[PDB]
Amino acid sequence: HPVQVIAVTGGKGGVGKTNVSVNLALALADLGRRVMLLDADLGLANVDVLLGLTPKRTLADVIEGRCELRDVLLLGPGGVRIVPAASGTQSMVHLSPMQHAGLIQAFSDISDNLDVLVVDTAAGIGDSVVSFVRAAQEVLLVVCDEPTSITDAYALIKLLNRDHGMTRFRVLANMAHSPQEGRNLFAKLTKVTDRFLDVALQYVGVIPYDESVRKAVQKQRAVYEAFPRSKASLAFKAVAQKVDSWPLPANPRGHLEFFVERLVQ
Amino acid sequence: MHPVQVIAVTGGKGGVGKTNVSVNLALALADLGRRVMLLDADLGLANVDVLLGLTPKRTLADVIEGRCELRDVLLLGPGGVRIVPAASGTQSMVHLSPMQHAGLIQAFSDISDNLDVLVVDTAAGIGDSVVSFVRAAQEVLLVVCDEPTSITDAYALIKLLNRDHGMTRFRVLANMAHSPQEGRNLFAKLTKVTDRFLDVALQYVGVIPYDESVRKAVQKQRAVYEAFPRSKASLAFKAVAQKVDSWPLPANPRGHLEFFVERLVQHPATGSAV
Amino acid sequence: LFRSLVGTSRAIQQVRQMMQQVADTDASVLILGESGTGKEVVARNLHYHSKRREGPFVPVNCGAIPAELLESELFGHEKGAFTGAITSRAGRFELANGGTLFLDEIGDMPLPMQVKLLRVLQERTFERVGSNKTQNVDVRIIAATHKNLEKMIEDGTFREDLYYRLNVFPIEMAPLRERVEDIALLLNELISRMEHEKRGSIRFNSAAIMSLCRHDWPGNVRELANLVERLAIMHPYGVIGVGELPKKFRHVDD
Amino acid sequence: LFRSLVGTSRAIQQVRQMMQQVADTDASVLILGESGTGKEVVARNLHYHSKRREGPFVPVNCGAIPAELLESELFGHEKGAFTGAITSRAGRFELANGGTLFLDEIGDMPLPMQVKLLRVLQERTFERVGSNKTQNVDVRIIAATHKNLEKMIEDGTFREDLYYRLNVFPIEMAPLRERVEDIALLLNELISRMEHEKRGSIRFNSAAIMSLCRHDWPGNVRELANLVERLAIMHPYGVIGVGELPKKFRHV
Ligand SMILES: Nc1ncnc2c1ncn2[C@@H]1O[C@H](COP(=O)(O)OP(=O)(O)OP(O)(O)=S)[C@@H](O)[C@H]1O
Ligand SMILES: Nc1ncnc2c1ncn2[C@@H]1O[C@H](COP(=O)(O)OP(=O)(O)OP(O)(O)=S)[C@@H](O)[C@H]1O
Ligand SMILES: [Mg+2]
Ligand SMILES: [Mg+2]
Ligand SMILES: [Mg+2]
Ligand SMILES: [Mg+2]
């Protein structure tokens, strides 16, 4: 009955957050879930770009009061409903906290036959990212095997734990050149978090470095749709299996979150 | 004396190489004999220190929280580049207000020992931290890669700066280009869009090639310019620094918040007053 | 998932008696105690043991919601009402109708919201933001705080009248440092809760239980429950010996 | 640094006369004109002909500084003043002491700031944000606006007393379209400066200049200068005809 909500994040730019959000959403749809994908990079939208879509309206039109969320939904590959964001619209480059809250609350109107909401967050760890991450039920950090990505992911985990008491994080290694590289990267991250924090990290697995992803970005088609048998796409199906076995939320927590009414039952 | 050149390295899209460019451009400029300062303006998610393998005793968090002054956090890096390090996840630094960004930019007036060298490494995105530092700088250097998302985000940043702030002149650097002709074609893709929709002046700086030596350098947490001095990427950074060093110096203050405004006035008592 | 608080300690029996004091009334409840003591378990237990058992249980954390957003969270709003009100929506009070509203960290509630909370307690009415049509609500308030409300009254940060309205038979939680003899029982309970919500499974051996009974736990219980979650992710369906604990919880020699 | 007022038109001739007429006084100047008409160039030329020529020239754009920052920018602040006030620092009034402060887009100044500006005009003193210590400065005010300040007084958005204090010596900048006979001269000036700063080089043939003179110039001069800079970046050292000038400059 509750809707699973996954915030795809990781702090560091360019580690594959949007590629992961897009292709995980597709892989979940392919597994048989009803999936919605919110582009929460609100003023620098990329989900539509990666799928080659040209929305007539976006969240800018909702935020500015010209239409409702249901008006902007797009029926994407495998029936993933896409909520498209804006690309440089003044209105969307700084939403107030009240506008964030109103937007997150507005999703309760389109929740009807929905199993999973995937939220693609912007780069960084500012208040907007953190509001979307906190509003979700699961936090999926995308990490690459470079010191800057490990440091930024750790900084995000530290902020969410220190300032908001969050303790459970899902870690996906992306662009690994071997499965052992993904495992070794998870080991590097857990070394730092074990040393300084008390948090629970689950290793979800790895998305391999794959030229098919680069080709798909150039084609502006999801690698999962355009190269369904590439290593990256097979890896997304495996990740989707892991994600689908996550426990569903039971109770509302006390703060701003998606679909609170359904959590109250 | 002379005005300080101030370059904001930006681009909107994440992972296009903004910090690698800021760091190695700063080192290359220092190699030419310039006194260089490098500000990590990714204020809550510092990466300059990470790329350089440094562990600063103090950061901008110490300034914001009133434990020391801005001068006290300057860190001597490779080639003598002086670094203003940012914070990583520190609660005081992850949601700075516009007034805090402005107070910080103003605080930089306490500095008079650099030439052509505030390199400002901006965060991903086009929010207020980015835009305030980009507007406070004298040159805007957009780092762009040959993917639809980087082109789209660079365009959106150019469009915001033009539409909302009247900015017309932008420098464009192609990074991770698999050949020089690919970077030139990339510049042309971007200008096809900006020519169609805007009235802006884009200047092509050139290309930093895709180079395995950058990936190795990032793993080692050393600047590619120092760790791999003869790789093609480091030679390209030397060339870009020479071009940057030939850019015209700022002449006059514009009327808004910008770095080192008291030196732009070009008057001894004004320059002495702050 | 209603279980009487587990444990044999004196402290927890006092807490159970405080709960019995208010369990058969429909009055507002106040839960005092250090952060992480277990107040939401108490509130949901009270909810189950009341006529409102089948109604909604709605939590709000005043310390986890910005001051400027709390009014809209609590009372809801109408679509035209303010810049971000893009839809009309019921707030937490309306969602709690016929049930219980768990108001946690009320020591962080701003004074205007304390005024409106008192209005709900006394008149059983409220208005959505951007509307002044009066609405009725039949909700039981269970409030909680870790702060010294009497010091807040003296600092001017908490209303005296609200204090006298809420502070009648406060449930006073005991910190874990006063309940060491309960830790083993607590661990079983936490595992059981984890299994019940399909979140994982583990079993401790006696050496690991002993090390955890030797650990300090300033974070109270929540800290214990966090470690149980963490171990169920480190070693899913595994047996937890001292070597399976994170190094800081190992107390073989101390 | 002083740019020259070029052109043969009667409007620019008058402006040049006025620079000399007001050279003997520190009277506040108010320059009215559409956006981009050259108001700061006039203000610098006025300063250069004033008794303050060797003092500083300090611009402030009340339209490009957020309302909450403008007081700190104008008056300075002490370190304890507001959350982001991490240093003590003189503001633009102090930086202009002995010289000229150019308040651009004065019609964007908030009303509380208008009261504080009026006080500094009258009493020639001010206080830093976060302080009550009195500061003396001797600054000559040149303000500029593209808005109808009198209707703003009627609407209650601008103060009448401040307006009368600023408008001692008024100057009206003609829009570019009322002085297209100047464009050739302006182009030579723009290009010349562009070359002397090594920012590029361009020439126009006579047909291109005719087409440009046929233009509406919503952005006045500023738009002309942006066009020069754009074509120079576009056709380095080129000769601009009519084909190189193709939408909205294209009239032939
Ligand atoms: N599995 C992969 N294999 C190969 N290349 C990949 C893979 N995943 C991502 N990439 C590359 O990484 C680039 C960046 O991916 P994005 O999804 O835009 O990352 P991001 O983390 O969302 O970046 P931003 O700008 O912070 S939103 C893509 O355009 C691809 O070039
Ligand atoms: N010239 C290059 N050749 C090869 N790899 C490069 C090159 N430039 C950048 N990279 C790679 O791109 C990664 C991202 O570089 P960054 O400098 O972190 O980009 P960034 O734009 O600052 O990303 P942010 O700040 O998180 S938005 C580096 O870690 C390298 O792996
Ligand atoms: Mg993205
Ligand atoms: Mg960076
Ligand atoms: Mg100075
Ligand atoms: Mg005062």
Decide: helix, strand or coil at residue A23. helix
CA of D125 relative to ligand 6 center, distance in Å: 12
Choose among D66, D68, D198: nearest Cβ to B248. D198
Domain boundary among C137, C154, C176: C176
Residue C175, exposed/middle/buried by CB under 10 A (0-12, 13-18, 19+)? middle
| Distance to chain B for A264, nearest Cα, Å | 31
Same domain, C146 and C83: yes
Same domain, C120 and C228: no
After which residues does a break in chain A occur, C–N more than 2.5 Å? none
A44 Cβ inside 6 Å of ligand 1: no
**Cβ–Cβ under 8 Å, residues A199 and A169:** yes
Beta-strand pair D140-145/D169-172 = unpaired
Same domain, C183 and C76: no
Q: Which two tokens stand for residue B81?
A: 């580049």
Which of D110, D1, D229, D97 minimizes the C-alpha distance to B253? D1
Continuous segment of H or E residues that includes residue B182 = helix B180-197
Same domain, D199 and D151: no
Which of A94, D95, D86, D58 minimizes the C-alpha distance to B102? D86
Q: Which two tokens stand for residue D57?
A: 């020239």
Cross-chain residue pair C198–A247, CB shorter than 8 Å: yes
Q: Which two tokens stand for residue D144?
A: 């500029």
3 state SS for C47-100: HHCCHHHHCCEEEEEHHHCCHHHHHHHHHCECCCCCCCCCCCECCHHHHCCCCE
CA of C88 relative to ligand 3 center, distance in Å: 31
**Residue at token pair 């280009």:** B177
Decide: helix, strand or coil at residue A42. coil
Cross-chain residue pair A122–B124, CB shorter than 8 Å: yes
Domain boundary among D176, D202, D225: D176
Q: Please, where are the H alpha helices in D50-182?
A: 67-75, 92-95, 111-123, 149-155, 160-166
Name D23's Cβ contacts closer than 8 Å, sequence gap at least 6: D49, D50, D51
Name B196's Cβ contacts closer than 8 Å, sequence gap at least 6: none
**Would you give the DSSP letter of residue C219?**
T
Binding residues of A: 12-19, 146, 174, 208-210, 214
**Residue at token pair 């601008």:** D158
Question: The dihedral of CA C215, C220, C222, C225: what is its sign?
Answer: positive
Q: Which residues of B touch D40 (CB under 8 A)?
A: 255
**Cβ–Cβ under 8 Å, residues D194 and D230:** no
Question: The dihedral of CA C3, C5, C9, C15: what is its sign?
Answer: negative
**Cβ–Cβ under 8 Å, residues C116 and C74:** yes
**Cβ–Cβ under 8 Å, residues A4 and A116:** yes
3 state SS for A180-208: HHHHHHHHHHHHHHHHHCCCEEEEEEEEE
B175 Cβ inside 6 Å of ligand 2: yes
What number does the ligand 2 atom closest to the CA of B208 have? 1
Chains with 3 or more CB pairs under 8 A to chain B: A, D
Q: What experiment produced this structure?
A: X-ray
Q: Which residues of A touch C60 (CB under 8 A)?
A: 254
Same domain, C29 and C153: yes
CA of A49 relative to ligand 2 center, distance in Å: 21
**Residue at token pair 């939401």:** C40
Give the burial string for A158-173 (b: 16+ CB within 10 Å, else e).
bbbbeeebbbbbbbbb
Same domain, C72 and C172: yes
Number of residues written out for chain A: 265
Give the chain B residue whose CA is nearest to the CA of D65: B256
One-letter amino acid of C145: T
Which whole-number Å values give the CA distances from B249 to B119, B243, D57, in the listed order?
14, 13, 18
Instruction: Give the integer Cα–Cα distance in Å for A12 and A5.
Output: 21
Cross-chain residue pair A46–B127, CB shorter than 8 Å: no
Which of C39, C32, C164, C170 minimizes the C-alpha distance to C107? C32
Instruction: Give the integer Cα–Cα distance in Å for A151 and A196.
Output: 13
**Cβ–Cβ under 8 Å, residues D249 and D183:** no
| Distance to chain D for B114, nearest Cα, Å | 20
Choose among A68, A108, A202: nearest Cβ to C89. A108
Chains with 3 or more CB pairs under 8 A to chain A: B, C
Chains with 3 or more CB pairs under 8 A to chain D: B
Pocket test for ligand 2, best of B210, B214, B234 (most atoms within 8 A of CB): B214
Q: Which residues of A touch C39 (CB under 8 A)?
A: none
CA angle B29, B30, B33 (to 5 degrees): 95
Q: Which two tokens stand for residue C195?
A: 């299994």
**Residue C212, CB half-sphere, CA atoms under 13 Å: how many?**
32
Tell me the residues of chain A between 145 and 164 that have a Cβ less than 8 Å away from chain C.
164
Which of B15, D64, B164 minimizes the C-alpha distance to A88? B164
**Would you give the DSSP letter of residue D89?**
B
Name B131's Cβ contacts closer than 8 Å, sequence gap at least 6: B160, B161, B165
Bridge partners of residue C58, in order along the sequence: C101
Instruction: Give the integer Cα–Cα distance in Å for C57 and C185.
Output: 26
Looking at the structure of chain A, the number of domains it has is 1
| Distance to chain C for A30, nearest Cα, Å | 24
**Cβ–Cβ under 8 Å, residues A191 and A185:** no
Same domain, D167 and D203: no
* Helix, strand, coil in percent for chain A, rounding step 5: 50, 20, 35
| Distance to chain B for A188, nearest Cα, Å | 13
Cross-chain residue pair C230–A106, CB shorter than 8 Å: no
Continuous segment of H or E residues that includes residue A93 = helix A90-93
Cross-chain residue pair C61–A255, CB shorter than 8 Å: yes
Continuous segment of H or E residues that includes residue A149 = helix A147-164
Name C62's Cβ contacts closer than 8 Å, sequence gap at least 6: C70, C103, C104, C105, C106, C107, C108, C109, C113
Give the chain C residue whose CA is nearest to the CA of A127: C66
How many angstroms from the chain centroid is the CA of residue B89? 21
Q: Which two tokens stand for residue D191?
A: 């290009």
**Would you give the DSSP letter of residue B260?**
T
Give the chain D residue whose CA is nearest to the CA of B64: D86
Number of helices (H) and strands (E), helices first, in chain C?
Answer: 10, 9
Same domain, C46 and C81: yes
For this entry, resolution in Å reads 2.0
Largest CA distance in chain C: 66
CA angle A74, A133, A41 (to 5 degrees): 45
Which whole-number Å values give the CA distances from B191 to B187, B198, B200, D65, D233, in the listed order?
6, 10, 9, 30, 12
Which long-range contacts (C-beta less than 8 Å, at least 24 apart) are formed by C36-39?
C36/C219, C36/C220, C36/C221, C36/C222, C36/C223, C37/C146, C37/C173, C37/C174, C37/C175, C37/C220, C37/C221, C37/C222, C38/C5, C38/C173, C38/C220, C38/C221, C38/C222, C39/C104, C39/C144, C39/C171, C39/C173
Same domain, D97 and D4: yes
**Cβ–Cβ under 8 Å, residues D88 and D135:** no
Q: Which two tokens stand for residue A260?
A: 């609170």
Q: Do chains D and A touch (3 or more CB pairs under 8 A)?
A: no
Looking at the structure of chain D, the number of domains it has is 2
Q: Which two tokens stand for residue D120?
A: 């500094």
Ligand 2, atom 8: closest residue by C-alpha: B17
Instruction: Give the integer Cα–Cα distance in Å for C34 and A220.
Output: 53
One-letter amino acid of C19: M
Mutate to test the interface with B, among D69, D139, D201 (most CBs of B within 10 A): D69
Instruction: Give the integer Cα–Cα distance in Å for D19 and A227.
Output: 71
Please give the backbone phi and psi of residue D91, each rounded to the nearest 5 degrees, phi first. -100, -165
Domain that holds residue C203: 177-254
Same domain, D228 and D122: no
Binding residues of D for ADP: 6, 36-41, 193, 222
One-letter amino acid of B42: D
Cross-chain residue pair B15–A18, CB shorter than 8 Å: no
Q: Which residues of A touch C230 (CB under 8 A)?
A: 167, 198-200
**Residue A16, CB half-sphere, CA atoms under 13 Å: how many?**
27
Cross-chain residue pair A98–C68, CB shorter than 8 Å: yes
CA of C134 relative to ligand 5 center, distance in Å: 60
Same domain, C24 and C123: yes
**Cβ–Cβ under 8 Å, residues C160 and C153:** yes
| Distance to chain B for D73, nearest Cα, Å | 8
Domain boundary among D109, D142, D176: D176
Domain that holds residue B63: 1-274
Name B107's Cβ contacts closer than 8 Å, sequence gap at least 6: B63, B70, D86, D87, D89
